[PDB]
C-alpha cells in the first residue's frame, strides 16, 4: 500500500514506479536462478549479473547510470531514493508541510469598519470550517436528535 | 507495514555505499572507485588474499 496499484475508471490502473522497478528486479533475478540451474557459459551469467546489478542500482536510485531506465512512456522512473531526496520527496513536501483540514481560501477585501483584532469571514466559509463544532453545539442543545 | 524481501541469487552492491563520493566501499578498501567499477561490471578480476 505504499507503492499502490489503485484502479482507475473504466479499467485503467494507477501504479507507482516502485512496482515496475521491483518487477524488473524479480524478473532478472529469477532468470539468473534459471541460468545457474542450467549452468550456461560464463558470458551469459556475467551479462545477467551485470543486468541484476544495474536493476538493483536503478531501483535504489535510478540515477548513477547515465540513462535512467525510463518507464513505458519515455520518462525516467521515480526510483526509491526519489521518494526521499529533494523538493518532491517526503521530507520537504509531505513531512515538513502538509495539506491541512479545517482550512479555506478566498479573495480578500478591505473592510475599514473592523477593529484591529477581528477579521470578516463569509458565512459559508465559517459554516464549512466550523461544521464539527456546530454538530456538537446542536446535539448538546437538543435541536439535532443525532449526528446525521 | 509488512515488507517482503528478495533473496538475490547473486550479491549486488549498494549504489549508495558506492557512489556517494566519498565512495564508502572505495576507501573502506582504500581502493579507487574506477577499479571497483572495473571489478563490479566483470571487466577486471580482483584478488582476495
Amino acid at each position: 500500500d505504499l507503492r499502490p496499484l489503485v484502479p482507475l475508471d473504466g479499467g485503467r490502473f494507477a501504479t507507482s514506479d516502485l512496482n515496475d522497478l521491483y518487477r524488473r528486479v524479480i524478473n532478472r533475478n529469477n532468470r539468473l536462478k534459471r541460468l545457474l540451474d542450467l549452468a550456461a557459459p560464463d558470458i551469459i551469467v556475467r551479462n545477467e549479473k551485470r543486468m541484476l546489478q544495474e536493476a538493483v542500482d536503478a531501483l535504489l536510485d535510478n540515477g548513477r547510470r547515465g540513462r535512467a531506465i525510463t518507464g513505458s512512456n519515455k520518462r525516467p522512473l521515480k526510483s526509491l531514493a526519489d521518494m526521499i531526496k529533494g523538493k518532491q520527496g517526503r521530507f520537504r513536501q509531505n513531512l515538513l508541510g502538509k495539506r491541512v483540514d479545517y482550512s479555506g481560501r478566498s479573495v480578500i477585501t478591505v473592510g475599514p469598519y473592523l477593529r484591529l483584532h477581528q477579521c470578516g469571514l463569509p458565512k459559508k466559509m465559517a459554516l464549512e470550517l466550523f461544521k464539527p463544532f456546530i454538530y456538537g453545539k446542536l446535539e448538546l442543545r437538543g435541536l439535532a436528535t443525532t449526528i446525521k | 507495514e509488512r515488507m517482503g524481501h528478495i533473496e538475490l541469487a547473486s550479491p549486488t552492491a549498494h549504489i549508495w555505499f558506492l557512489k556517494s563520493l566519498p565512495s564508502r566501499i572505495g576507501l573502506l578498501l582504500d581502493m579507487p572507485l574506477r577499479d571497483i567499477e572495473r571489478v563490479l561490471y566483470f571487466e577486471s578480476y580482483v584478488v582476495i588474499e
Binding site: 551479462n47 543486468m51 547515465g66 540513462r67 | 567499477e37 561490471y41 571487466e43
Partner: peptide, 11 residues
C-alpha cells in the same frame, strides 16, 4: 584498450 562505459549492452 577502451576507456570505460556503463551501458551494459555495450559491455
Amino acid at each position: 584498450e577502451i576507456g570505460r562505459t556503463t551501458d551494459p549492452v555495450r559491455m
